[PDB]
Amino acid sequence: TEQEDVLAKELEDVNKWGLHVFRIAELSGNRPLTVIMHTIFQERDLLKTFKIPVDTLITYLMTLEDHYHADVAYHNNIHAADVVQSTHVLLSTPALEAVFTDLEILAAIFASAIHDVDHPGVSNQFLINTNSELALMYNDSSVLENHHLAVGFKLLQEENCDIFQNLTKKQRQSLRKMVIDIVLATDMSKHMNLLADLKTMVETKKVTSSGVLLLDNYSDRIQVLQNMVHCADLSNPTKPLQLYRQWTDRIMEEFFRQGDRERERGMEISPMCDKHNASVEKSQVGFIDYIVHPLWETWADLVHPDAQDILDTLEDNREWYQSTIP
């Protein structure tokens, strides 16, 4: 089949920054997370290493993917597939060669896959301000992130979905802890603290003669994995412009829908959520200057000079967005 052939060809770029993820979503019948996760697991030999039955992996992935909302413009299965694939590329950074174990690799990829599952398309602050059941359950802290974790793990208990069935008890405990530590770190309210700690690691950085990072204890290892997945989460502005612009269109649609809910409820409209008073291009330049560039520049220092091409693209995109402002 032509559709199946073109999908296979697009998936050959799975190890590259700038994978045509939207095209893959279309060609796979809206199954980018399932096909990209399966491809990556095969590429890294994770099914054999952890004795994961192929049917079990696909069943879990399809179930997980079904729990991403198809009517949420940004925080959906395409975003999850994109973060998974971006983490997969970051794990292959020369400076991290042989740094992480297969279990740590599995944890980072799994964390990426479930990190926004069942996202309702509204922010933690909106959930807190509307006295939502989610904010009540989670006592106003990392409300969404706790929920994404709970759903991602609970789905492993569905029929033929336990992809970790052949891991030892110790491996399962370690993976669970790492996944929780990683997904909770994707809460944007923790960004400044995560970045501050990453900068501290860079200053005291220890490397081999080839530039490979030397991370001994759990605190340092998980910190790098947390920042890696956080970078993947915040990687849209570092992708080829055609991809970045699509992600911007999607987050603005999602944000505007939240603002529409806020406006009708008589709530103050959140930043970037007012479709009648928006400055999309100025907001992207601000996002890059204050959040994305500071993070990626620090990551680039940690793995110097492996992230130079990513940083170059980010700066090209910032320049272009700035040029659209008269």
Ligand X SMILES: CCOC(=O)c1c(C)nn(-c2cccc([N+](=O)[O-])c2)c1C
User: Which residues are known to be catalytic?
Assistant: 75
> What is the CA angle 296-113-202, rounded to 5?
25
Query: In a 10 Å sphere around its CB, with 0-12 CB exposed, 13-18 middle and 19+ buried, how is residue 18 labelled?
Result: middle
Part in contact with Mg ion (CB under 5 A); list of ranges 13-21, 94-102, 161-169, 179-187: 179-187
- Those residues whose C-beta lies under 8 Å from the C-beta of residue 211, and which sit 6 or more positions away, are 94, 95, 304
Q: How far is the CB of 145 from ligand X (least distance, A)?
A: 9
Q: Are 229 and 113 in contact (CB under 8 A)?
A: no
Q: Is 146 annotated as a binding residue?
A: no
Q: Find the binding residues for ligand X in span 239-258 (CB under 6 A).
A: 247-248, 251
User: Is position 230 annotated in a ligand binding site?
Assistant: no
Work out how close the CB of 121 gets to Zn ion at its nearest, in angstroms, rounded to a whole number.
Answer: 12
Quote the least distance from Cβ 232 to Mg ion, whole Å.
Answer: 11
Q: Does 317 bind ligand X (CB under 6 A)?
A: no
From the CA atom positions of the chain, what is the Rg in Å?
A: 19
Q: Is residue 118 within the footprint of Zn ion (CB under 5 A)? A: no
Nearest approach in angstroms of CB 190 to Mg ion is 11
Q: Is 233 annotated as a binding residue?
A: yes
Q: Which of 77, 142, 223, 236 forms a contact with ligand X (CB under 6 A)?
A: 236
Q: Is the N-terminal amide bond of 305 cis, ω within 30° of 0?
A: yes
Q: Other CB atoms closer than 10 Å to residue 266's CB: what's the count?
A: 6
Q: What tokens does 188 get?
A: 């944007």
Shortest distance in whole angstroms from residue 83 CB to Mg ion: 9
287 belongs to the binding site for ligand X (CB under 6 A): yes
Closest by alpha carbon to 310, among 14, 16, 12?
A: 16
Sequence length of the chain is: 326
Phi and psi at residue 138, to the nearest 5°: -105, 10
Write out the H or E segment, with its range, that includes residue 54: helix 54-66
Residue 51 φ/ψ, nearest 5 degrees: 50, 50
Query: Tokens for 76?
Result: 């959906």
Among ligand X, Zn ion, Mg ion, none, residue 188 binds (CB under 5-8 Å by kind): ligand X
For Zn ion, the binding residues in 219-238 under the rule CB under 5 A are: 233
Binding-site partner at residue 247 among ligand X, Zn ion, Mg ion, none, CB < 5 to 8 Å by type:
ligand X
Instruction: Note whether 234 binds ligand X by CB under 6 A.
Output: yes
Q: Which is nearer to ligand X, 233 or 306 (CB)?
A: 233
Residue span 168-197 as binding mask against ligand X, x where in contact by CB under 6 A, dash where not: ------------------x-x---------
> Which residue type does 238 have?
T
Binding mask 100-139 vs Mg ion (x if CB under 5 A, - otherwise)? ----------------x-----------------------
Round to whole Å and give the CA distance between 198 and 243. Answer: 27
Q: Is 204 helix (H, G, I), strand (E, B) or coil?
A: coil
**Contact by Cβ (8 Å): 309, 89:** no
Closer CB to Zn ion, 194 or 213, in the complex: 194
Point out the annotated binding site for Mn(2+): 116
Q: Give me the residues that bind ligand X (CB under 6 A), please.
A: 186, 188, 233-234, 236, 247-248, 251, 272, 287
The binding site for Mg(2+) consists of 116
- Binding-site residues: 75, 79, 115-116, 233, 236, 284, 287
